[PDB]
Amino acid sequence: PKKNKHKRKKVKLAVLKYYKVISRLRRECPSDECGAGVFMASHFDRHYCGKCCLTYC
Amino acid sequence: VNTALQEVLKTALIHDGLARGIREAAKALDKRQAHLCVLASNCDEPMYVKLVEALCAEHQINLIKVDDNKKLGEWVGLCKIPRKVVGCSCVVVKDYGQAKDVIEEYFK
Amino acid sequence: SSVMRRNEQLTLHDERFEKFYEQYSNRLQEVLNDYYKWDCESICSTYSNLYNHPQLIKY
RNA sequence: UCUUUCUCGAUUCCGUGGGUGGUGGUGCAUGGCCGUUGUUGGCUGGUUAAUUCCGAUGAACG
Ligand SMILES: [Zn+2]
């Protein structure tokens, strides 16, 4: 039952999925500190901002 | 044209304006704070080497193409003393601090 | 500062120190509402000593 | 901690040492400092039976 430390999933080129060719494939955080680059996590039911932690469903 | 870019990237390191890495480069691009971009010509995966000038043209940002990335990386300060030599494929200079005039007239 | 200096051999970087010496809400109400039988010695009696004897040469 | 990605970016993290070790425990020398082997003076507040309670608020002589 030894506690193994968590290891981050090193995904190849995490940046290369929010754009085309131009536009934003993910929407933008509408907050004050967040926007114009703070991209929106889109899980299968829900939406996440990684800085200010807004909960959008 | 490389020697006229080395001094402006050096003063970018002095004033900490440049953003190393693709994601920080894009974050400088879409915030409309960017001034110029530098792209390495040795890019094996092709879908991002075409995206950077697409974003630069969408935000009206000038671009310079350099053949090497590890040489570009050691110019932009990704090495310590040099034992470890790692390089970057793209870097955006957000703001500057003589040859910068040469670069900006080379853009025109 | 000082008076005795480099004089030779390749200063690399330019030693920025100017930032060190001279240095010296709807979500609020939202989270406010969110607030409320054998052992090693006995088994030796199991082993026999009468099966695989080498053939004996007599005198 | 186990899923699904968003962000911080060099503040890094993986392996092998019979090599040390340090927020370690422990004794000695070691510098400072206590205590140790007389005499005469000198009230905004609430609270209680009540100058009640809490609460702000010095000197010489041998
Ligand atoms: Zn946000």
Side-chain angles (χ1 to χ4, degrees), chain B residues 33-57:
Chain B
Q33 299 297 108
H35 268 192
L36 54 87
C37 174
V38 180
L39 161 73
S41 309
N42 44 3
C43 296
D44 293 336
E45 52 268 17
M47 73 291 291
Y48 90 104
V49 76
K50 52 185 290 275
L51 181 52
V52 54
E53 87 272 0
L55 277 157
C56 285

Side-chain angles (χ1 to χ4, degrees), chain A residues 29-35 38 40 49-54:
Chain A
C29 176
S31 197
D32 46 354
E33 196 266 330
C34 301
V38 185
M40 183 37 49
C49 175
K51 284 278 286 184
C52 74
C53 187
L54 281 173

